[PDB]
Amino acid sequence: SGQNLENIKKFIRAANYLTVSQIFLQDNFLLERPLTFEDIKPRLLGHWGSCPGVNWVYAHLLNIQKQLEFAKSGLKAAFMLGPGHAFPALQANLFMEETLSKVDKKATRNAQGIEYISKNFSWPGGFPSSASPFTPGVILEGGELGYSLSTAFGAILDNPNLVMTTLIGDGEAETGSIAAAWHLSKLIDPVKNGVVLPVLHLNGYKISGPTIFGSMSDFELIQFFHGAGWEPKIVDEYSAEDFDLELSNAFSNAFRDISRIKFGRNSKFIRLPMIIMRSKKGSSGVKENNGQKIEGNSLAHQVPLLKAKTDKNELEKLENWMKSYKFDELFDYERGEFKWWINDFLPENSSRIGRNRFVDANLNFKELKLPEITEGFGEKSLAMNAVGSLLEKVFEKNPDNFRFFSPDETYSNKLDAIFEATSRSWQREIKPWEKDLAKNGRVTEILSENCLQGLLQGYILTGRYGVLTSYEAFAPVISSMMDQYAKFLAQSKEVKWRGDLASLNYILTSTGWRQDHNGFNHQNPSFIDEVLRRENGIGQIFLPADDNSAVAAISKMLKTRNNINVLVAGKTPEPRYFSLESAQKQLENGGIFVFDSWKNQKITDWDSISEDDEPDLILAASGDYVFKETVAALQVLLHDVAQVKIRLVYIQALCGKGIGTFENTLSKSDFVKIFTKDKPVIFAFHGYAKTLKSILFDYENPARIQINGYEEKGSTTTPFDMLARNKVSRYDITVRALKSVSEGDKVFGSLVKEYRKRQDDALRFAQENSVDAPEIENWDYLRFF
Amino acid sequence: SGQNLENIKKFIRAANYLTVSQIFLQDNFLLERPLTFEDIKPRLLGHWGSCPGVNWVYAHLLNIQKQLEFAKSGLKAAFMLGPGHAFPALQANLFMEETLSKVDKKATRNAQGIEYISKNFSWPGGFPSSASPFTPGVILEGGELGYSLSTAFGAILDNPNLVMTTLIGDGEAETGSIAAAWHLSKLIDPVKNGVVLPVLHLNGYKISGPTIFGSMSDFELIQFFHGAGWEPKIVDEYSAEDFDLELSNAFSNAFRDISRIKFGRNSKFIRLPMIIMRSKKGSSGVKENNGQKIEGNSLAHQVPLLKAKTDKNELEKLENWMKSYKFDELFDYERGEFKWWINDFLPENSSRIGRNRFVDANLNFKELKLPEITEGFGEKSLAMNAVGSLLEKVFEKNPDNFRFFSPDETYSNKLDAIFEATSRSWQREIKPWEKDLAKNGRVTEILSENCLQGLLQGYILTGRYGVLTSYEAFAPVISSMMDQYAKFLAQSKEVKWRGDLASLNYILTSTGWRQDHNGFNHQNPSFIDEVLRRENGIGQIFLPADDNSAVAAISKMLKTRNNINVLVAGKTPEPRYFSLESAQKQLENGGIFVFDSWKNQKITDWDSISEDDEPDLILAASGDYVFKETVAALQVLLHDVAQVKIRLVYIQALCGKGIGTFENTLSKSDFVKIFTKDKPVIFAFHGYAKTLKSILFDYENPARIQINGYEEKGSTTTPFDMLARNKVSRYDITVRALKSVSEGDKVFGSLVKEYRKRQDDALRFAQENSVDAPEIENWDYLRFF
Ligand SMILES: Cc1ncc(C[n+]2csc(CCOP(=O)(O)OP(=O)(O)O)c2C)c(N)n1
Ligand SMILES: Cc1ncc(C[n+]2csc(CCOP(=O)(O)OP(=O)(O)O)c2C)c(N)n1
């Protein structure tokens, strides 16, 4: 180890030297001639305070891996960077090993490469300042802090030979997402899956002040993490030999992991180890500047020497800083390459940390096999039951790359049919009266919506499949996390060596239109608006009409790649309108159904519509609950006024580019064919009225379109009262249609009075009896089977 | 003490009986005649599992308050309900006092009130099923789990004599918001601000499964909660001979410790006590049904007997359950009132938990005194410095009801001028090289955006003032919590005894147009769109043009009541366009400025705008960065074309009802006057293009309006490159304008050519030199003062 210990010091010294070169230097990288004012970048950008901590961890992980390969191999280690602002330290480590040269040819480990990476850091058109899809071996960007611990647990599933080492800052540990994720070890079995190894950087400071975790003593830190289900060890820089103590720390930790993953002699809960390291922020850099305590203080976070290009005394400080690392003893200047010491340090080439086989996709991604599609039976359509039955067969046909995530809502959402094939993962004691709990369950449930999102994206980014479901009103809790993932997808489209991934799928049910045991607090359809705002061909919403439409919607979602999808439907018995055999699947090529009521003619070809025969009024809807009110309103209008020709339209899908899907998006010319150039359009929507207004802005004549939807008005009451409160009931729609057609008061004045009276009677019945009126309860609806 | 325990037991029995009555009965509440199928609600709604714990906590708190009042102490206790689905227990507890009768006259403590509260629970038009603004003494809705601990810590911020007892469920404790809030005791001094006493309801089950905290042992729980700054005590129903006796002892010891800490001394960090209560879920209810173990299991969460109105066996169980309480020994049936025992147990009417003087906003709200507006000027506008200077004086003139919250970005946002008046609160050790830390600081900083939002809304709901600032891109982290607050405001508008509250104010800066040390991750302008989505006269956005406009807007924000406000502006040196007096006039006219370039005439009154003399093109912008590009583009066109008339428009504020403020919102007729009915409009926006499209949907002729925004494209580069990447720059604005007037391409073709090569040259210079071109850097802009 004595020869090994000294070799690690050379690796850390060289990594530190290259980190400084990328931040400051524009020329004279090897320091052959004295530094001047022309060898400094015009704008200094980047961060330095946390960079020395990254260099320490990466070098010690490389030494451990070589020991593992020497005897009793099998375990492959990876690296996760939580503090994404420490990217220049990560770039240097991927350069000293030949990982970077496999993607970019100009990044060869010679004098030409040193100038290339140093000059192009943070340069316009060069490398970015933070982690991104352009860096090999990267799955977490780390921009918005707090989503590292949960993502590591998601990429560690079904990979028994992967050990993921994730670095978390002490400031980042104060986030709610990190605080909840410490209990994730109580639901995941580390024998059939891998092991997550977290490292707490604990440099003591945030941007401009101390940290909560830095103020705690040694006794407090051990007690807290030992109560969270871990085994922490503490190493601090205020000791005799930091590198010697760090070496024994990482060695003894990996020893525990091997003595636990292969013996399998434990049936109770396990205690995974973790590392807490304490160090001075910005170590080995500038100590003081104007007597202001740069090192060991929050002032080392960003660039320390701000005026190195203008101040003579700052230029000197930078030169003495870099000359502290004796780079001429590690690099051969005449040849232009490292000395022989580096090849001894990392002799094995296939299993280098930055090219891990388990973490990297394109080596594990496989197609998903879909079972046959069967119709639904009965008089009442139950959308959630049909989807739950289809997902049960998917679990059987793909026993290795499918998983399900929910915040204890699968029973409430009527999706428990998936429990005939698997259970819920649980590593603690199980009671005799408890059911559906197993150690190897493929469904993970926890009340933290952020932890569930982290596990799902860790699974998909490694090359697997998964689905997440929850209450619709509580989806916006993870709006920011979805946005960060959406930025990963758009950037990855410009990388030629990335490949393909499965899409992110959401099932949202138990909407606010039918919240019976709850009230106003559970009605918030804002998440689907957030998804539609991405503008790089990302974001699709499915709005099924019945159970037949639902099963082919989830089937289409499971076949799409590199996107984000959301499904919204109810869970209560509902009328069934369409047949699955041919009608409903044909709708999916466009996602719109058109019915011409005055001739009982269904339309599927948009070019058969004739200008000679057009409706006097168009009734439209999007959403199962608002479609039922629209069909009922058409029945009332067909009975009373026969001269008014009405065209019925339902929209099953919406995308960020317009109406329909990305594969088949409705054009502007077709929109004029369906909706006449100048005719009233009454449109009822499942969500906010402004969400649809933004989409319909780019279509023809938006002045004549009346849009109604949820308006943040409701309480605990009957389902009909909720529709009438927001003015989307059947009698609300039929009054609006009469007003729009002609004058609206010539003969329909008496009809408007009668329909208003009917609505008044129904609301009065509910108040007295707490039950919907028999006229609406036993309504006979239309069907297009 | 000997007589008190029996009174507590009687109180708990009565509360349980009333809870069951509210859940089930619609008639025969006193159980005189035998129960039949006609005395059951047609629709059973509600929850029962957590109800028994609330009764225990409330009764013991009442006993403690009476004891405290006896011993001449100034401590007043309040109650906070985390599990908002346990509302019927809280309603029963409030009814047994006179708190409910002080607000509703029909809720008197007799048989009429008993029937009134029992029948109207969850009834259409009656009381809701969850906590709401309609309940006295309520500030937290509790529909979305979490936020209770943070709101409680925000409530005790200037009330040294208020002790807030908050009840947290074990499933709720798994959320990140609750997980992060356990460290809030390291920033708040309890001696001068009050004490928070949290109770953990460890019933052991979520909706349909066990809990993370229920699986841990006593050793693990003690070690974990002692790891934070707390002193936990555990009482469990399973192994205790006298659960009520243990509960009383624990509460008495906790309050004795609170009094000793408050009134003795304070030198170092102080550990506050907390209570962990372990009990069987749904205790005292039905035990088994079809051999399924209702009690002590997750099946007791909702209504236990779903078919009591159709099953003979279920009807018997309900009758036995209710008769087990022996209500006839506590209620006088002939006089229809409680016996004398209740009057010997309750405290004096002033010292009752339901009416805590420190919680009501009506007894604490005071006006805010605004310092004189010193609209100073240097050479370049610095909006953040001007705002920070004004906020410094506000701190001095209101030394008791103003506070500031930020996630460690005070220095980064250029708002450190407020540090001449106050420091940052900190209760741990302070180092010699650290500055701006004090035990009594009025600025609280923590990286948890959820904790900061909880403290701010706890402060405002008690009747005080506060401001929150953060990064615009990371604002959407707390999007859901703002929505829950918005539901409180709309509901409380219908309550006639609520009163007035201050506004929720946000300052967002360091936008994505000038992120220099970060790239494409700190770029997300979605929070303002979420705020603009509430539809009850809530949601206002301010978009200042310079520092003079910034101070005018912040002064207006501090004077508005019962709303939510957001201000977005940059922090870099910028041109100055408007004077001290013109800016304030604009805000009182609708926040819009109009300039007629071909005549050098400014317009302030929308009447008398000549229809004969109208522009050929309208250039518009909203946002400081996009306004600079629009002014520069106007100069180029004025120089080159000089024959087409251009009108310049800037928008300073947007509301949920249209253009302007709620007090003064631009009308449809005025919109036609400013923007000509049929002329092209080129509009550049600071945020997403679809956010403005939804607002402009309701205005005149949307087909002729072109909108460009952030578009989700960028990386680490120069400021001009970022503007040009998203197609918002002076040259591409001039190209868009030239094509609009004559797209026939027979004219201005060479001009369209020339402007593109200028952009190409600028981008090439940026790529080569890492700085912007001198032609753009040294540009001379317009000014209107
Ligand atoms: C959610 C969020 N809030 C704020 C920021 C701004 N920010 C970037 S880095 C940083 C400090 C990180 O501190 P720490 O974890 O101690 O890191 P280190 O000192 O190791 O760099 C902050 C607040 C952010 N990136 N994300
Ligand atoms: C953020 C959020 N996610 C999910 C829910 C759905 N929900 C309502 S109650 C509940 C379980 C509450 O469990 P707990 O508080 O531990 O139990 P109790 O005290 O009521 O017995 C859940 C998940 C919610 N209200 N909020």
Side-chain angles (χ1 to χ4, degrees), chain A residues 18 91-98 107-110 113-114 117:
Chain A
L18 279 182
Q91 184 94 309
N93 285 284
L94 292 171
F95 170 85
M96 293 174 75
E97 86 182 20
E98 310 277 50
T108 318
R109 204 184 51 190
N110 51 27
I114 281 187
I117 70 157

Side-chain angles (χ1 to χ4, degrees), chain B residues 510-524:
Chain B
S510 312
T511 77
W513 295 110
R514 275 289 322 238
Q515 275 277 350
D516 302 318
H517 293 247
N518 321 279
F520 192 65
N521 266 0
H522 305 54
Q523 281 145 242
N524 198 17

Side-chain angles (χ1 to χ4, degrees), chain A residues 409 447 449 474, chain B residues 50 85 143-145 169-171 203 205 207 281:
Chain A
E409 281 175 28
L447 234 163
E449 270 93 346
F474 306 147
Chain B
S50 34
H85 53 268
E144 191 177 295
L145 293 176
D170 39 358
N203 50 19
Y205 288 95
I207 298 181
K281 213 191 162 131

